[PDB]
Design a protein around this ligand. Structure first.
Ligand SMILES: [Ca+2]
Ligand SMILES: [Ca+2]
Lengths: 284, 284
């Protein structure tokens, strides 16, 4: 089963479809990654909505409160970033691939892709001849191998009959000339076989040349996809990369500052003035 | 409403109990955030496991199959950084608060922190000599404010008892005693409501003293907690920041590298040699 075996070009043709399917796989892949990012963002948001509420209603006041409260903002900000990845993966990468797909494969009226049919017929036309001059070069192989086994009979039937009491000038003759319609026949086919075999090696270079034709045509098509894949993945890479986004760092620089603004004393001074000895008192 | 109003110290005392609850709230807050970080990593890990298989058993081959495989790596590595966040939030932040909480609030087996009573009883204590005298002054208030109306009750019995059928002198002669004896009381009563009111001011400066003495305790306790939130929050802030890890930038360098490593031309050669014309063929 080598590429040259009549009809083994099927693998090359199979690749045109694999191409379209790989396009869909990659879309699903990026889509799944998008749903995941969105899920993380949504959770961070729920957490932020939930704890901003709980902290506000709880007995925590002052700068320590704000400090605590800054994390809800941090959570919400991270969420946004991840929704940007989701957006990028979807509106950019996903749509890009979806369009490349529709622009590279076209439906055949009957069903299937034109570029696949185009390659299928190309390989047929290019192999049609060499194959014909093989179906017979294969049939002339049986006509011979059927004699090189039919000859072992005229020699076998004359050895089994050579030892029998019911022999006659006739029965003994119906085995004599048979070793001719075989011996002189085997050579008769030994030429049929040997001929077409050389009647094939004179068209073999032509056959290879035509197959290279169609094949190169397929490599050109595959090349466009392989290259398109590299371009796309490089963009998806930059989309997922939050490790270099200055905006991401800003979130935490801001977070810290808030946490530092936390001034205990001031919070205590407040409590003394609004709930402690510092309050006004109209004595008796 | 004022803090100096007897028993209003309750608020300063309730703060103690609240301090315990805030430690717990902050714990669950970090805990939930941890759950979310783990969810994300969990999800990124399934995606990678799923797509490493789909690509391996898929028709994508060559350098491009690895540029694709490179995103599963990114997924697995981002995931680890996140299980690292959870690990910190739980093993470090949550536990740190969990120690500070328990070992700072001596919870008395029966029910109630020994730190609360310390202030509860301390307040009752400092507010006894005052709540005591106030009870005297108070009782000496509705007593005099009763003698002032006691005489004005009899004066309406003498001057308002002349239009009665034949007045009996034996009565008016002593009916004027009622209106008189009253002033003898509004003489002493007025002297008590005024004497006690001074016995009240001879303790006010001492009252406030003992009172602001306990407050300061409570303040300094609350201050322990507040400063502690500032310290533990600065630590959580760090743990959340993914930028704080070098390997983070290394993930997208390694991703980019692999992708760039994708070569169309190269990948094609391989196909031609493993499925195309390049293949070896033993001709007939
Ligand atoms: Ca304890
Ligand atoms: Ca304790």
């Amino acid at each position: 089963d080598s590429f040259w075996e009549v009809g083994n070009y099927k693998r090359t043709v199979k690749r045109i479809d694999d191409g379209h399917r790989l396009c869909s796989d990659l879309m699903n892949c990026l889509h799944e990654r998008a749903r995941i990012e969105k899920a993380y963002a949504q959770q961070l948001t729920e957490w932020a909505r939930r704890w901003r509420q709980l902290v506000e209603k709880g007995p925590q006041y002052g700068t320590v409160e704000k400090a605590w409260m800054a994390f809800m903002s941090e959570a919400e900000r991270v969420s946004e970033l991840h929704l940007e990845v989701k957006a990028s993966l979807m509106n950019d990468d996903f749509e890009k691939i979806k369009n490349w797909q529709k622009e590279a494969f076209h439906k055949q009226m009957m069903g299937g892709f034109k570029e696949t049919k185009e390659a299928e017929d190309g390989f047929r036309k290019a192999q049609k001849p060499w194959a014909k001059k093989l179906k017979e070069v294969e049939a002339a192989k049986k006509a011979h191998h059927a004699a090189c086994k039919e000859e072992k009979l005229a020699i076998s039937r004359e050895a089994n009959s050579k030892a029998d009491p019911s022999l006659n000038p006739e029965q003994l003759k119906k085995l004599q000339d048979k070793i001719e319609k075989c011996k002189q026949d085997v050579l008769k086919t030994k030429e049929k076989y040997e001929k077409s075999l050389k009647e094939l090696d004179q068209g073999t270079p032509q056959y290879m040349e035509n197959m290279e034709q169609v094949f190169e045509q397929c490599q050109q098509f595959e090349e466009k996809r392989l290259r398109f894949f590299r371009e796309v993945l490089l963009e998806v890479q930059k989309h997922l990369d939050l490790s270099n986004v200055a905006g991401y760092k800003a979130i935490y620089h801001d977070l810290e500052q808030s946490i530092r603004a936390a001034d205990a004393v001031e919070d205590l001074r407040w409590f003394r003035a609004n709930h402690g000895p510092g309050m006004a008192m109209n004595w008796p």
